[model samples]
Target chain A: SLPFTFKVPAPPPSLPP
Target chain B: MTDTRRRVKVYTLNEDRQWDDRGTGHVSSGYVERLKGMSLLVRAESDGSLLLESKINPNTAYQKQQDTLIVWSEAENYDLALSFQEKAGCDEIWEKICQVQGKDPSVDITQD
Candidate 1:
């Protein structure tokens, strides 16, 4: 079975700036 | 062309965290457009059927041992291991996983 997901395009930075 | 895949033996963790051999297969990590995620896909070497698939998660744990073997968890529930044919391939996927998870890569989870 799979886990997790993402949106279209490059991810929106998983960490804070 | 994005290239990062290798042949490996796949295994699941037992109750005692020991590896239970599943099968030998090809494993890949990349942006699965259909799934919309950076994911790992393992396919059976015999018939090419998908054996397993999982998206990279930051909360998951990863460790590499014996140079070409990698073990990781699917959160707190499931654990999977991959024994690659070569050390280079093993390092490649391990780094890719860490990259997707937004973390710096390590050769082993318990770097000492």
Candidate 2:
């Protein structure tokens, strides 16, 4: 078994529909 | 200069490329892939910076994952999309596409 850290970029802002 | 090879770049000038962030980013869907997997990063504005440029079209199928928006583009020969959950990114994009297509944008693309 292997464990690793997954780094995700911070998402920018979203808008109203 | 652009070649048969796909690429990604950011630009603030006209002659420079704004493939990722511009309103016309995917203006014509069949163009991007000559059957390939490509990654691109760039800086530009959607319909926001200039409303005149807002009429851009042929966008991708988008969904929201967390705060991120996942865009799916099906090119003629290949299939690829992007994750752009950044603020105002997909919002302007969808708005432009919806406006040009004569469709209502009241549906949240992320609701799926």
Please provide TM-scores, in order, for all candidate models, with all chains considered together: 0.70, 0.32
lDDT of 2 by residue, A1-17 (tens): 42521112232233432
Candidate 2 Cα errors over 4 Å, as ranges: A1-17, B1-67, B108-112
Write the residue-wise lDDT of candidate 1 on B1-112 in tens digits: 4233487878776665456777778888767777678888888877889987888766666676557777666756577778877667878888887777666775467332
Candidate 1 has a DockQ of 0.02
Query: Model 1 over residues A1-17: C-alpha lDDT tens digits?
Result: 42421111111232561
Candidate 1 lDDT: 0.68
- Residue pairs whose backbone atoms clash in candidate 2: A12-B86, A12-B87, A13-B86, A13-B87, B69-B85
Per-candidate local distance difference test:
0.68, 0.32
| Candidate with the greatest DockQ versus the true structure | 2
